[PDB]
Design a protein around this ligand. Structure first.
Ligand SMILES: [Cl-]
Ligand SMILES: [Cl-]
Lengths: 386, 386
């Protein structure tokens, strides 16, 4: 399967895709010079379908620009672009009670506020990465403050109580990004707790499944919502854990855990008729009720590309190279827009395009550039060690 | 052409489908003998995929059974079934603040409560129809009490205010059902206000569109949510208005209003590539972001079948017979399950089945049986006058 020359070609592919295709689609043109932050809700040709701003994606974009500055090239325009988002978050995206908005207008007026703290987690990683890039001590302090607030909420996130895997997952990745940028003494211990929560409550070895939600004792909630799985989301967590495994000196327990989550959810998620990762499944193969259950979204593919390549480089198991080849070829052939750049977001089960937009309230410069950046970086490291 | 002969055939077809196929799929087996209410979340073969109870659908089902008893046949089984749903609503489906739940367990414990009051409107029409079928004065008083509360809610309620067409539409049909069962002196004057609201704010003659939401002054909100249209929903409102026109001795002004709404949204909503009514469209033909925008759902087809047949019997315009033939043939050929009865809910754009369930949190014994019952009784009245 994958030779070193082939992995060298893959490294260059992800690098050139990231820097010559994906990032230029968004930046610098998406930087809103008049109001700050980013205009990211763009059609296939780059034209705007909306001038609203999703607060999560403002933070994700600021994180990406800072991360490119810190790990790829110290381009002033990326630093300036990151600062524009940080400033927009601080100036407009916090309510008087200190909680962040979810959805604001171009000029920063609030449209939606969600009880969630997920906006805050993306402000943490954005401020952490920006603090590293710029030396801004205020951004460092904000990142560490909000991290604690996020921890606080995570301990305490209605006759059918359920806990969701997304809390430990997002907190783990937030803690990882905080560690890898400016550092914080809480990161490693809490990551341990969040991994233990994922393993204990959400990974079911007897049925080879990773749950999206469970009851507080870990039991499966046998109702429509509780049965609904998201393979791409579970495999996102799997590679967060494989990432942690490497940091922890290739810890065999964490390698085993990440790999089995990936194994379980590749089997449940990969569409053997049409190819690609199904968005939702049902733990007992009852019909999934969420309407988009069999659609092919971009971001599950981004996460499975990372996970399979990461699993392959860590374990050397050829099957992960075979799965990587499958999902990589599937995703780049079906989502990538060779004419205008970047990726479509939304395909039907059979791979035909459902609509042409490349950015909206949920899609922006995050999952795809993170995958291309992470894979380019991973392979550079891997090839240096070979 | 739609001859009297063809319309007689259709009349018998809808009657046979309603009584030999649609209703038997649900009743009596869906009657929850232990806890009351109805077990309606069923797979294609009738097996339960969940024992939860959607409060809207408990009221809709009680309304249907009462309506059948009143207008088709005084089956004791239907009356007893209607009372089961009424009692379940009264016993379990009101919160301590007087607002109704949206989603409860089999035994009536709350799962979810929504800010809307659509639960209440379906309790109105259920109690009204049951009050007529049984002479229960408590149900009649309840229907009128809840109706008054819905009126207050509708008149006595973010930097982007929007008003939705669903409120005046649902309130209109609620009032119509109240009028046609037990009567209420407020029905006609409030229907007039709601029709005026629909015509003034949501119907756009210049661009031939019916909006889902507009700004308080009626202007189009040129953002993703504000641009999103629902042709089936607009056409549901169209036939509510055509129904009112008939009630008002074929009021030509309401005929024109209902017909232009139908004309506008047939043109925007009918899928010329694959057939069927698309779920969402965009007023300016920008890409629609809601994931299921191009799926083919059962209930838009139910409503367009009513609207086209009603428009045809009222106006005699052959185009509405042509449109009815198209949507009738499309819907019964694609959604109807000849093997087990009733209709699948969810098809892809190209008409292929997305999943097999026939009842869930949103689909149950309502839109389809209402369409078959309404078309059967409409054609019976129409052919009695020829
Ligand atoms: Cl994204
Ligand atoms: Cl329904």
């Amino acid at each position: 399967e994958y030779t070193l020359e082939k992995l060298k070609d893959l490294q260059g592919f992800y690098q050139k895709q990231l820097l010559d295709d994906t990032v230029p689609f968004w930046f610098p043109r998406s930087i809103d010079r008049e109001f700050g932050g980013y205009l990211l809700m763009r059609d296939q040709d780059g034209s705007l379908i909306d001038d609203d701003k999703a607060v999560w994606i403002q933070g994700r974009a600021a994180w990406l620009l800072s991360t490119l500055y810190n790990t790829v090239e110290q381009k002033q325009e990326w630093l300036d672009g990151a600062k524009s988002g940080i400033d927009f978050l601080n100036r407009h995206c916090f309510d008087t009670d200190g909680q962040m908005f979810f959805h604001v207008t171009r000029d920063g007026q609030p449209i939606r506020k969600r009880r969630y703290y997920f906006s805050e987690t993306f402000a943490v990683i954005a401020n952490a990465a920006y603090a590293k890039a710029s030396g801004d001590e205020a951004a460092a302090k904000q990142a560490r403050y909000l991290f604690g607030k996020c921890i606080e909420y995570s301990t305490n996130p209605g006759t059918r109580p359920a806990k969701g895997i997304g809390v430990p997952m997002i907190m783990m990745n937030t803690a990882q990004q905080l560690r890898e940028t400016i550092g914080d003494p809480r990161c490693d211990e809490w990551i341990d707790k969040w991994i233990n929560e994922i393993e204990t409550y959400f990974v079911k070895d007897d049925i080879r499944c990773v749950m999206e939600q469970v009851a507080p004792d870990g039991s499966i909630i046998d109702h429509i919502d509780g049965r609904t799985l998201n393979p791409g989301h579970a495999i996102e967590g799997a590679w967060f854990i494989l990432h942690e495994a490497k940091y922890r000196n290739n810890d065999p327990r964490l390698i085993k855990l990440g790999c089995k989550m990936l194994d379980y959810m590749w089997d449940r998620g990969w569409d053997k008729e049409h190819g690609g990762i199904l968005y939702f499944r049902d733990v007992y193969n009852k019909p999934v009720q969420e309407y988009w259950q069999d659609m092919k979204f971009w971001w599950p593919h981004n996460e499975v590309i990372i996970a399979t390549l990461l699993a392959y480089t860590i374990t050397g198991e050829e099957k992960y190279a075979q799965w990587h080849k499958l999902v990589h070829e599937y995703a780049y052939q079906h989502f990538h827009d060779a004419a205008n750049g970047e990726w479509f977001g939304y395909l039907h089960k059979d791979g035909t395009l459902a609509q042409t937009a490349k950015g909206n309230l949920f899609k922006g410069p995050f999952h795809l550039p993170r995958q291309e950046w992470y894979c380019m970086t991973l392979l550079n490291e891997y090839l240096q060690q070979s």
